[PDB]
Amino acid sequence: EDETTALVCDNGSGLVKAGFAGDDAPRAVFPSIVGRPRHQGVMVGMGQKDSYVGDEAQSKRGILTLKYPIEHGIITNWDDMEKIWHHTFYNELRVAPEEHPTLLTEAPLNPKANREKMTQIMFETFNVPAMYVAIQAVLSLYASGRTTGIVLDSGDGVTHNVPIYEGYALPHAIMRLDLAGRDLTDYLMKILTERGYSFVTTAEREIVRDIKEKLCYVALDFENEMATAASSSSLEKSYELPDGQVITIGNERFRCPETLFQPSFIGMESAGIHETTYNSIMKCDIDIRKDLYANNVMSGGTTMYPGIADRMQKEITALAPSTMKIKIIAPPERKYSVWIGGSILASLSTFQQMWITKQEYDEAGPSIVHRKCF
Amino acid sequence: EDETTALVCDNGSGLVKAGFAGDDAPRAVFPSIVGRPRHQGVMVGMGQKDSYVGDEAQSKRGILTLKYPIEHGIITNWDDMEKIWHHTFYNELRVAPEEHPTLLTEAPLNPKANREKMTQIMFETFNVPAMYVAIQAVLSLYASGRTTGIVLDSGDGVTHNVPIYEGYALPHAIMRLDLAGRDLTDYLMKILTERGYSFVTTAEREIVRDIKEKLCYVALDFENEMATAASSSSLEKSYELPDGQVITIGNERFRCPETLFQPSFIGMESAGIHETTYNSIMKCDIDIRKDLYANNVMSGGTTMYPGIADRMQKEITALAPSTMKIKIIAPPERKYSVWIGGSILASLSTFQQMWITKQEYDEAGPSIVHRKCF
Amino acid sequence: FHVGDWMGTIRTLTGNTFSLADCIPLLRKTLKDESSVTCKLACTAVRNCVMSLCSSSYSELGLQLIIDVLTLRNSSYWLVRTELLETLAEIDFRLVSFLEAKAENLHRGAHHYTGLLKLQERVLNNVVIHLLGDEDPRVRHVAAASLIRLVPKLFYKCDQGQADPVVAVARDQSSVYLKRIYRGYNLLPSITDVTMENNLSRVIAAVSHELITSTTRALTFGCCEALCLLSTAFPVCIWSLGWHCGVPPLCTVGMATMILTLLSSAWFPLDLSAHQDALILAGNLLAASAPKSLRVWPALGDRALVPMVEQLFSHLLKVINICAHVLDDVAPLGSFYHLPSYLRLHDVLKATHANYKVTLDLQNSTEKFGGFLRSALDVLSQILELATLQDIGKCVEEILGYLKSCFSREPMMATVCVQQLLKTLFGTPGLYHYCFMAPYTHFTQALADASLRLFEPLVIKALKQYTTTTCVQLQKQVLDLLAQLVQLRVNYCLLDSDQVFIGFVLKQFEYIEVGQFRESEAIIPNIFFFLVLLSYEIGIPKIIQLCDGIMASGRKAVTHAIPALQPIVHDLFVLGKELETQKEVVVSMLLRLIQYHQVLEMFILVLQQCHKENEDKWKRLSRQIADIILPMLAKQQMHIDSHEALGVLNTLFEILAPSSLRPVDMLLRSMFVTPNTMASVSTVQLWISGILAILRVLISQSTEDIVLSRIQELSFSPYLISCTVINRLRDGKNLPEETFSRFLLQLVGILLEDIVTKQLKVEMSEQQHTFYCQELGTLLMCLIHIFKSGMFRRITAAATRLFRSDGCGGSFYTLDSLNLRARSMITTHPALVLLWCQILLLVNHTDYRWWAEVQQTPLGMCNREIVRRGALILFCDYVCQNLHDSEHLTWLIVNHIQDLISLSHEPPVQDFISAVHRNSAASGLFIQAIQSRCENLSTPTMLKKTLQCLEGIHLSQSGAVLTLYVDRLLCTPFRVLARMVDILACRRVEMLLAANLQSSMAQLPMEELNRIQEYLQSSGLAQRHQRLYSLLDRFRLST
């Protein structure tokens, strides 16, 4: 065949998004979890199966202890990551990686060891002709079809911010903020406890993740919505657990995403996500700032909450000069924007010479990641 | 011959049920009694015989004093128990244990010594190639053809409750309730004295057991049935003793099985069979409650009365969330389900590598039961 | 396969109205008949009838009869189910997958189904592997032999060879028409087909799955019989990448860990009908690790592999221990006493041995002890090769006691157990590649190279058997046991006083010459190896007098006389004054026998030693066989009837010395000859093999200049075989440019009036039709080497004044007569109508009458799309070379549009398009064609191949590619076909404004620019693609 296709995988924490390069959507999207039978089984003709990977672990949740292998964009456990990639290629996509070049995404300001060990596994585990590791935020920018913007990337791993102008990139102005979907989940199960609902274990920690994926929203003013929580009517929502227990969540619902704009609630000094965007834009040159204000791109899974775009717009407009208009461009489909940006990149004809070849790795070693790529 | 077959023996208190593996129903069913002659006999040419076992004891009942060896799932004397196993093998079945793998059934939450001494008697009294001891409730689940369910198992032994989900087992959610059909026999003779019917020896104590297993039923609502007992009719029934004394029993008849749902009547704080079933389900994980509620399984000898399923369904439906539908599968034949579960289990090809062998016992001694099985 | 034209001739002659549309629904009905005797006879009618329809024009009705037999798989008469699977073994499921893609109503069929009509996974998972799990021993055996016949015929989707189902049918018909360690294992680099290793690894995936996940006794039992018949036709050592599953993760140990757990159970060996097939298959899977692992059991060198070999060598000494206590009535390392598992195996070898000794029947292949004792001495042999002296040194005591009792029942493979112990006790690709470009370049590369002692009780017993036996399978394994006691120098003490055994080999030469001996064929190659190897210690004077009797006084040569000298010549020429006289004797005998092509392999050995020993002697001997064989090739005495026979004679003229071939006086009088009579295809076939093998010499060994100076002197008239001379045989100033070109274009004319107009089973055989259409395959490779390589200057210009010319009043095969024969070659032989497409281009004959029939210029016949897509990859490569003629550019683009794009991964049509991007006016005509064919360019695979061809076109025609990127192709619902036409339309706007503003405005008009932006605002297309909309607003305001 011509061009050989190519393979693209996004592994921020929480979800593997994977598929062929040259398509508009990934074939396989599943949770990045390795769930191990904690309870010793007593039957004959079970499994045994040392561990379960992917949405198999979601189905068989109650037995398992679940371990996310990626925390804060950092792989904690390498064998668990290899198992997840083994699951992507053989269980879903049914590809031999020898037949495809593979793009991986990776997060900004990330330890060198993750990029270098990630390449070491791609060549010396799944034999592969070529690969690339690319920055998450630039891929979302490509997916949005814009040449310029400040990309606010927040996954389940960590929050990142990369300003770009006309292509290029500003290394000093790149900001990484330790907040995530996962930290909002840990805050959320903590704020459910005051209501009497106690979720203590990994299995129902993913149940509050599912709650937060739909019920939670961001206030267009926090204090105003917290004041109208005195007359509870629309702010309460009934939620059904898989147990058949019913949960009723009021003001507790919208103050969980409020943590992004008030990290004093989590107990971290690190500024809210709108001030981090100001911190990135202020580090940029005076000239370009006009379009960075007007071309803010949201990406990732934890920018999905209803009303985030409006809240960021009101806060950035309030802080900034009202001399210029602050447009925020946050697409629906923004969850998959990194994977789509990886699809478009590996489909680019020129990019087919910028691959890290297997040959170039075999001569010059794993350290060449940083030398060739950003 | 192929497979060598196997022998299956159920010996909860009150009834021995025994036969071959590969049958769907047993070859010998008889009461677990050892009957010794209390009165000295003055004739020449009698017997003599130390004791009568099984239904020789049922037949010659009035001369004797009758001893159950198994009380509350515990073997109280072991010459009496050895004689029952000697009798099953050599009188009805007519087999050499040397030819046959032997499966025995055993009770939830039972002292270790019952397993450890039981394996010693099978290995050292009746020489046997291999054996196994297996939990009663799991066998009755296998007989009812289900992978998932909550099993309420009760004999004239004790009442046991085991929840199961897609095989497995939850050890912390296994409940034992020391109410048996035998305690109902003692309750029945205690209530009968209100109408002047004094029964005092073991021989007519089994006449009230014989009354219990065909006149008694569970009231579909207790207060309602007790109120209409003011106008005696269908609620009273004639009964014939082998004496020729006629016995007429009324409200008495249904307030004997009521003791399972009201343990206050026998003077114990310990919650009812509906409440203990709820206690097990509350100990179980939140998700699996949905299918445990809709797959309640009844087995054993004292789950045989009319109105038990009907009542357990009213009382569990009243206590449980009515957002889901409580279904109890209480089949006919449920007295024999533990045996049927053993005959199917010993007929599984995979299970023939799970036996405790004579060699493993000879090498590693009695304690190995709790190192291979449940 | 011309059901159109042949039915017209009959109807005006005999006026019946009977088409084949009125007989297949008469054949579809008897398959559904009630009685199980009526259903046995209607399924042999589909053995004859569905290999001829499915490659014909009626292959709409031909696929339906494949479907209905699949419903006949579960009828309860055991003869009804085994004549199904023979009509599912003779199916070519690479030709069957091609019709599915063309169907749209046949996938629906009755009741309007949705989905694909998956014949292949339904006929392989739910019949053939399913009928392995049948109850009958008759039905389980016939289903294994179909998986020997299905694996070369599968075509699973998207290999890294054959891509389309069009390219799949084209590679099985081009191999047809265009060209001592033990038996288990291999040490070669093992050149193998990459795509034939993929079809054999999907039939061992679904077969190890009904052996592990099976729940019956009958699925485990008859699927160890289907794995032993793969490994004797598709061996594990040669096809190891198909058998590989796991073990050593890289030469493989495939799947051998499950089958040892079948044998160690006490259930599975208790029946000898399929315990003997699980021992021949566990020795094939521990021997394919021998090219890797070899550097207890110190020679295995892989400790994950030793418990698999410790078990079988423990398993095969306990089964020669139960066959020793059965042949001798003796009560019950290798020991089966204390095992209760192998006391069950002693009551099963004693039921099959009470029926042999009681019922006398000698000639039975299947005996189940005589079949079972054959299986466990074959695989005790193959393991000892892996063993050493140190592992066997405690067991040479053991294995020799059992064979003295195991000798009398089967001595044929009880010395194959003894032949091996003494070794290890003494140490020892897209339809342009396949049809043309891969076979065209094996042609020109071999032309540049053409320009260049506990045995002492057991050994004495085996010699008394050879004098008294009569079966000649046993007489062959005893002459190899004695050629190993002389190499490994056992002193000649087997016959301590006398010469008893050597006197008996001389008498057997009396029975072969007269013919009083039954099976001399399978012993005469091994009789003569024993005799020559003793003389290094009967001497070589006496050895060569015995071989002269068999030849002149005895039977024919290809069984007796020609295998008689393969031991002598290899052991006399390869390996003082006495040795010089005996080499003159052996070369004179072969000159009497040159006629046979097996005698010409022995004589390639003779010429390679004289080039090494003495180069003065090398040139004398190649002159003596120069003037013998070339008088034979004109009188056709040389047996070149096989394609094993033309391969031996062409490696002879390379190795024959070029001084003996340097005068071209001899090679031409042997060339330009007429046979006696060409009535018979025994005699037509040996005259056209003399012309193909002396023409491999006039191309390599001598150039074009030398050949044509000679024919001016030798009056070789071009009326030699003319259309007046060729007609009387079947019933019964000339240039040297002109003499040699009428001889090669009228010899294409003899081979094509036969294959069309001769019956297929009447006049010729089928083995004689493998080699008659294969002499037209290497004579059209000789004509495209003369017209392309340029060394042959004078021969190219001569054909162009002849194909343009008419015949001489009808005295020649004229060029319009020769081309009617080839279009009825379209359908029977589609690989050889791609070689006639490349000749007519090469002569300047681009005549649009013949080029439209082969390309169809405005279900399907499966054997024409190899030629329709094969003549359009070859008609572009003629346009790409001389692109100065614009008459051929504007024809192929306007007419063939849906074919020109859909080939764009091919090396001759990839080069046709880039020149169109180079040419100014030729690029503008390509874009008018797609706007007419947008209705077919909507399927997701046909639109990915347009954007790689509309990628970069001329800058003067980038204004017509931007009205096509917006109006037609951007509204596709495919969101990576709406994303990849955003990369190509933003790039046209950017190169235009850095270019001249003068030429671009006349290119993209000011009135035409306002039409485009009204399409994007009423629709949502501008707000979807932001990058396309920004670039067009800045265009207007500067202008």
PDB file of C-alpha atoms in Angstrom, chain C residues 167-296:
ATOM      1  CA  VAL C 167      -4.319  -9.301  -8.029  1.00  0.00           C
ATOM      2  CA  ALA C 168      -4.956 -12.611  -6.233  1.00  0.00           C
ATOM      3  CA  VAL C 169      -6.117 -14.637  -9.245  1.00  0.00           C
ATOM      4  CA  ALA C 170      -3.219 -13.310 -11.316  1.00  0.00           C
ATOM      5  CA  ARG C 171      -0.449 -14.935  -9.310  1.00  0.00           C
ATOM      6  CA  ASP C 172      -1.684 -18.541  -9.360  1.00  0.00           C
ATOM      7  CA  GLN C 173      -1.859 -18.486 -13.156  1.00  0.00           C
ATOM      8  CA  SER C 174       1.566 -17.000 -13.804  1.00  0.00           C
ATOM      9  CA  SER C 175       3.583 -19.644 -11.978  1.00  0.00           C
ATOM     10  CA  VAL C 176       1.787 -22.143 -14.213  1.00  0.00           C
ATOM     11  CA  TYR C 177       2.382 -20.352 -17.516  1.00  0.00           C
ATOM     12  CA  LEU C 178       5.636 -18.415 -16.913  1.00  0.00           C
ATOM     13  CA  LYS C 179       8.758 -20.177 -15.706  1.00  0.00           C
ATOM     14  CA  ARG C 180      21.870 -37.223   5.439  1.00  0.00           C
ATOM     15  CA  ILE C 181      19.665 -35.754   8.165  1.00  0.00           C
ATOM     16  CA  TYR C 182      16.324 -37.353   8.932  1.00  0.00           C
ATOM     17  CA  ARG C 183      13.094 -36.433   7.156  1.00  0.00           C
ATOM     18  CA  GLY C 184      11.708 -34.133   9.827  1.00  0.00           C
ATOM     19  CA  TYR C 185      13.763 -30.981   9.706  1.00  0.00           C
ATOM     20  CA  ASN C 186      15.874 -28.510   7.789  1.00  0.00           C
ATOM     21  CA  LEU C 187      18.981 -26.306   8.062  1.00  0.00           C
ATOM     22  CA  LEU C 188      18.713 -24.176   4.887  1.00  0.00           C
ATOM     23  CA  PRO C 189      17.969 -20.427   4.855  1.00  0.00           C
ATOM     24  CA  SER C 190      14.614 -21.700   3.523  1.00  0.00           C
ATOM     25  CA  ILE C 191      13.422 -19.287   0.825  1.00  0.00           C
ATOM     26  CA  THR C 192       9.656 -19.172   1.182  1.00  0.00           C
ATOM     27  CA  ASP C 193       6.648 -17.329  -0.200  1.00  0.00           C
ATOM     28  CA  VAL C 194       5.722 -14.468   2.133  1.00  0.00           C
ATOM     29  CA  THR C 195       2.017 -14.646   1.299  1.00  0.00           C
ATOM     30  CA  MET C 196       1.793 -18.430   1.342  1.00  0.00           C
ATOM     31  CA  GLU C 197       3.044 -18.342   4.927  1.00  0.00           C
ATOM     32  CA  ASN C 198      -0.025 -16.264   5.833  1.00  0.00           C
ATOM     33  CA  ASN C 199      -2.703 -18.670   4.642  1.00  0.00           C
ATOM     34  CA  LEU C 200      -1.159 -21.563   6.575  1.00  0.00           C
ATOM     35  CA  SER C 201      -1.178 -19.667   9.851  1.00  0.00           C
ATOM     36  CA  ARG C 202      -4.924 -19.048   9.833  1.00  0.00           C
ATOM     37  CA  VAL C 203      -5.754 -22.725   9.366  1.00  0.00           C
ATOM     38  CA  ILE C 204      -3.652 -23.693  12.396  1.00  0.00           C
ATOM     39  CA  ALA C 205      -5.384 -20.975  14.434  1.00  0.00           C
ATOM     40  CA  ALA C 206      -8.931 -22.341  14.194  1.00  0.00           C
ATOM     41  CA  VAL C 207      -7.679 -25.929  14.487  1.00  0.00           C
ATOM     42  CA  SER C 208      -5.924 -25.572  17.840  1.00  0.00           C
ATOM     43  CA  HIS C 209      -9.161 -24.002  19.100  1.00  0.00           C
ATOM     44  CA  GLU C 210     -11.527 -26.959  18.605  1.00  0.00           C
ATOM     45  CA  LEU C 211      -8.871 -29.025  20.401  1.00  0.00           C
ATOM     46  CA  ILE C 212      -8.652 -26.911  23.570  1.00  0.00           C
ATOM     47  CA  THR C 213     -12.070 -25.237  23.824  1.00  0.00           C
ATOM     48  CA  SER C 214     -13.831 -28.419  22.710  1.00  0.00           C
ATOM     49  CA  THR C 215     -16.332 -30.201  24.949  1.00  0.00           C
ATOM     50  CA  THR C 216     -16.686 -33.549  23.166  1.00  0.00           C
ATOM     51  CA  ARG C 217     -14.657 -36.701  22.763  1.00  0.00           C
ATOM     52  CA  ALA C 218     -15.165 -36.416  19.007  1.00  0.00           C
ATOM     53  CA  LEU C 219     -13.673 -32.935  18.531  1.00  0.00           C
ATOM     54  CA  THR C 220     -10.377 -33.742  20.270  1.00  0.00           C
ATOM     55  CA  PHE C 221     -10.009 -37.046  18.473  1.00  0.00           C
ATOM     56  CA  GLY C 222     -10.293 -36.263  14.770  1.00  0.00           C
ATOM     57  CA  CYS C 223      -8.474 -32.979  14.884  1.00  0.00           C
ATOM     58  CA  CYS C 224      -5.254 -34.662  15.857  1.00  0.00           C
ATOM     59  CA  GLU C 225      -5.742 -36.456  12.540  1.00  0.00           C
ATOM     60  CA  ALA C 226      -5.998 -33.170  10.632  1.00  0.00           C
ATOM     61  CA  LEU C 227      -2.742 -31.845  12.067  1.00  0.00           C
ATOM     62  CA  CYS C 228      -0.725 -34.880  11.017  1.00  0.00           C
ATOM     63  CA  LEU C 229      -1.698 -34.489   7.361  1.00  0.00           C
ATOM     64  CA  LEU C 230      -0.621 -30.858   7.191  1.00  0.00           C
ATOM     65  CA  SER C 231       2.879 -31.670   8.419  1.00  0.00           C
ATOM     66  CA  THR C 232       3.459 -34.264   5.696  1.00  0.00           C
ATOM     67  CA  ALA C 233       2.503 -31.875   2.883  1.00  0.00           C
ATOM     68  CA  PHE C 234       3.281 -28.503   4.525  1.00  0.00           C
ATOM     69  CA  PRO C 235       6.174 -29.476   6.828  1.00  0.00           C
ATOM     70  CA  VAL C 236       6.907 -27.481   9.970  1.00  0.00           C
ATOM     71  CA  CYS C 237      10.603 -26.938   9.262  1.00  0.00           C
ATOM     72  CA  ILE C 238       9.940 -25.268   5.914  1.00  0.00           C
ATOM     73  CA  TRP C 239       6.872 -23.237   6.896  1.00  0.00           C
ATOM     74  CA  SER C 240       7.845 -22.409  10.477  1.00  0.00           C
ATOM     75  CA  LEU C 241       6.560 -18.832  10.408  1.00  0.00           C
ATOM     76  CA  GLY C 242       3.086 -20.218   9.813  1.00  0.00           C
ATOM     77  CA  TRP C 243       3.314 -22.781  12.610  1.00  0.00           C
ATOM     78  CA  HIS C 244       4.821 -20.309  15.068  1.00  0.00           C
ATOM     79  CA  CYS C 245       2.706 -19.397  18.057  1.00  0.00           C
ATOM     80  CA  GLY C 246       4.711 -18.162  20.985  1.00  0.00           C
ATOM     81  CA  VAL C 247       7.631 -20.487  21.825  1.00  0.00           C
ATOM     82  CA  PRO C 248      10.930 -19.337  21.344  1.00  0.00           C
ATOM     83  CA  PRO C 249       9.851 -15.766  20.576  1.00  0.00           C
ATOM     84  CA  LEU C 250      12.208 -14.759  17.788  1.00  0.00           C
ATOM     85  CA  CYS C 251      13.302 -21.885  13.983  1.00  0.00           C
ATOM     86  CA  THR C 252      10.089 -22.454  15.945  1.00  0.00           C
ATOM     87  CA  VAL C 253       8.384 -24.806  18.391  1.00  0.00           C
ATOM     88  CA  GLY C 254       4.782 -24.301  17.428  1.00  0.00           C
ATOM     89  CA  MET C 255       1.860 -25.462  19.563  1.00  0.00           C
ATOM     90  CA  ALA C 256       3.649 -28.553  20.882  1.00  0.00           C
ATOM     91  CA  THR C 257       2.867 -27.866  24.528  1.00  0.00           C
ATOM     92  CA  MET C 258      -0.839 -28.717  24.323  1.00  0.00           C
ATOM     93  CA  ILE C 259      -0.412 -32.067  22.603  1.00  0.00           C
ATOM     94  CA  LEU C 260       1.907 -33.556  25.224  1.00  0.00           C
ATOM     95  CA  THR C 261      -0.878 -32.920  27.749  1.00  0.00           C
ATOM     96  CA  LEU C 262      -3.184 -34.966  25.542  1.00  0.00           C
ATOM     97  CA  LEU C 263      -0.811 -37.927  25.598  1.00  0.00           C
ATOM     98  CA  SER C 264      -0.049 -37.814  29.326  1.00  0.00           C
ATOM     99  CA  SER C 265      -3.750 -38.115  30.113  1.00  0.00           C
ATOM    100  CA  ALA C 266      -5.005 -41.643  30.741  1.00  0.00           C
ATOM    101  CA  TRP C 267      -7.922 -41.193  28.316  1.00  0.00           C
ATOM    102  CA  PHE C 268      -6.529 -40.314  24.860  1.00  0.00           C
ATOM    103  CA  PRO C 269      -3.959 -43.084  24.104  1.00  0.00           C
ATOM    104  CA  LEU C 270      -6.586 -45.815  24.667  1.00  0.00           C
ATOM    105  CA  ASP C 271      -7.498 -46.012  20.969  1.00  0.00           C
ATOM    106  CA  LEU C 272      -4.924 -46.594  18.275  1.00  0.00           C
ATOM    107  CA  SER C 273      -6.741 -44.910  15.385  1.00  0.00           C
ATOM    108  CA  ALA C 274      -5.643 -41.445  16.513  1.00  0.00           C
ATOM    109  CA  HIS C 275      -2.928 -42.087  19.056  1.00  0.00           C
ATOM    110  CA  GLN C 276      -0.669 -42.994  16.141  1.00  0.00           C
ATOM    111  CA  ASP C 277      -1.258 -39.610  14.508  1.00  0.00           C
ATOM    112  CA  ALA C 278      -0.380 -37.680  17.663  1.00  0.00           C
ATOM    113  CA  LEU C 279       3.119 -39.160  17.700  1.00  0.00           C
ATOM    114  CA  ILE C 280       4.039 -38.246  14.136  1.00  0.00           C
ATOM    115  CA  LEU C 281       3.022 -34.650  14.873  1.00  0.00           C
ATOM    116  CA  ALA C 282       4.901 -34.168  18.141  1.00  0.00           C
ATOM    117  CA  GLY C 283       8.164 -35.023  16.427  1.00  0.00           C
ATOM    118  CA  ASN C 284       7.633 -32.388  13.759  1.00  0.00           C
ATOM    119  CA  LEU C 285       7.315 -29.626  16.336  1.00  0.00           C
ATOM    120  CA  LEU C 286      10.481 -30.366  18.318  1.00  0.00           C
ATOM    121  CA  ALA C 287      12.626 -30.615  15.203  1.00  0.00           C
ATOM    122  CA  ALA C 288      11.891 -27.189  13.780  1.00  0.00           C
ATOM    123  CA  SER C 289      13.927 -25.800  16.701  1.00  0.00           C
ATOM    124  CA  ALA C 290      17.038 -27.560  15.310  1.00  0.00           C
ATOM    125  CA  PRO C 291      18.280 -24.644  13.114  1.00  0.00           C
ATOM    126  CA  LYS C 292      18.282 -22.458  16.248  1.00  0.00           C
ATOM    127  CA  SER C 293      18.726 -24.136  19.593  1.00  0.00           C
ATOM    128  CA  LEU C 294      21.574 -26.599  19.260  1.00  0.00           C
ATOM    129  CA  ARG C 295      24.710 -24.632  20.217  1.00  0.00           C
ATOM    130  CA  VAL C 296      20.673 -33.583  30.745  1.00  0.00           C
TER     131      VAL C 296
END
